[PDB]
Amino acid sequence: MSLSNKLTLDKLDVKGKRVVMRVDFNVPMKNNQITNNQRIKAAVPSIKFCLDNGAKSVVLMSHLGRPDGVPMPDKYSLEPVAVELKSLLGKDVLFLKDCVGPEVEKACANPAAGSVILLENLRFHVEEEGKGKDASGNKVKAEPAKIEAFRASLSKLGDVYVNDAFGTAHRAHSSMVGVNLPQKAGGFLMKKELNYFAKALESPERPFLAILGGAKVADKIQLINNMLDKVNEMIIGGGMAFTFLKVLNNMEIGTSLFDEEGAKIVKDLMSKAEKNGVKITLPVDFVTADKFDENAKTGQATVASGIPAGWMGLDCGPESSKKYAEAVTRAKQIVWNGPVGVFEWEAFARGTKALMDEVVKATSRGCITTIGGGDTATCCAKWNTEDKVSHVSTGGGASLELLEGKVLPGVDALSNI
C-alpha cells in the first residue's frame, strides 16, 4: 500500500525543470488568517527539495474550503497561505489570482530560476471537482470538454508533476488525477503518510491498538468492522461509546448521542471482536452535562448509575482514563482517530488530555503512535504534542479511507515505476 510501486520525488530529476505540485493547503481560517499552519509546514520538505535540486520553478496548487465551483476571492482565497509559506520558506512566494488561463500560463511558462508560485483556489472552478453549485445555488455538473481544457491548462504549468496532497488523496479531482505530464511523482509527505499507514495496516508492531472516538457512529461502521481484522485491541470512546453501552449494558444514557442504525450491529461487531481475539475497551464512567454548552452544569456517572434523564455524557471519567491508559501501555503501535470527549471545552477535555499524556509517554518508550487528522491533530496543536508522537497525519478524511480499506485516487494516478 506504500508508494513502492510508484514514482516518488526523491527519484525525480527536477534540475532546470518546472514542477507543478498539488498540495493540501486547505488550512483552517478565521477572519482571513491561518489558525493552524500544520498542513503548510508538512509540504515544505517537498518544496525545499525541489528548490535545493535546481528546479526552475515550483508552482503550487490547492483548494481551500468548499466554494463549490464559484470564484469566492473574498471568502476562500489562498492569498494568506502565500504569506505564511514565504515565512516558512525564507523565500518569496508569488500569489496568482487564478489557477488557469493565458495569464496564469504566461506567469508559469518560464519563471526566474528558483521561483515559488502559488495559484488561487482550485475550487473556484467547477471543473476541479467536476461538479458544484452555480451563483444561484443550483447544483451543476461540469462539461467534459471544459474539464479536459481545465486539466490541459494545469498541465502546462510544469514540466513534471508532484502530488504532495495526502489530505486530498481520496478526491478524484482534476488537480489530483487529471494532470497529464510524463512524470507524475508522489512527494515526500505522500510517501511519509502512506508509509506510516501501510505499516500500521499491513505489518504493525503488536499489540496494535486502535483508539476510535469522535461523535457519530454510523459513519464509523465500515471503519470499526475493517479495523477489527487488523488490530489486537480497540478503544471505543467519545460519542460512539453510548450506542455500544446501551446495547450491551442496557445503560441509561439520557440525551447522550445515540445511533439507532448502529445499535443494530453492535452485538455483531462485538462477536467479531471476540472471534478475532480483539480486546474492546469501552468507557465505564462519564462527565455529564445538563445541556450541550461549554458552561453547562456538570456531574458524574458510571455505567451502573446511568446518566440522569435530561443529561448527556460529554467526556469519559477517571476510571475510564485508567482503562484507556492500560490498553495504551500494552500497545506497541497505535492509530488514534477521534478524541474521547468534547475537548474544546475545558470541563470536558480531561479524558482526551489524559489519553494524550499516555500516548506521548507510549511514544517515549518506542510505541509507534499515529494521530489521524481532524480533531485529534487539532488536539496535538492544542496541547503542543505534535513533536511528541510518531506521526501527526495531515489527512483526516484520507486516513479514514485507508483505515476503511479503501483506495486513494490521488495515489493510483501517479506514474508507475
Ligand SMILES: COc1cc2nc(N3CCN(C(=O)[C@H]4CCCO4)CC3)nc(N)c2cc1OC
Ligand atoms: C463523550 O464523547 C462525546 C460526546 C459528545 N456528545 C455530543 N452531543 C451532542 C448533542 N447532544 C445534545 O444536544 C443533547 C441535548 C439535546 C440533544 O441531546 C448530545 C451530546 N456531541 C459531541 N460532539 C460529543 C463528542 C464526544 O466526544 C468527542
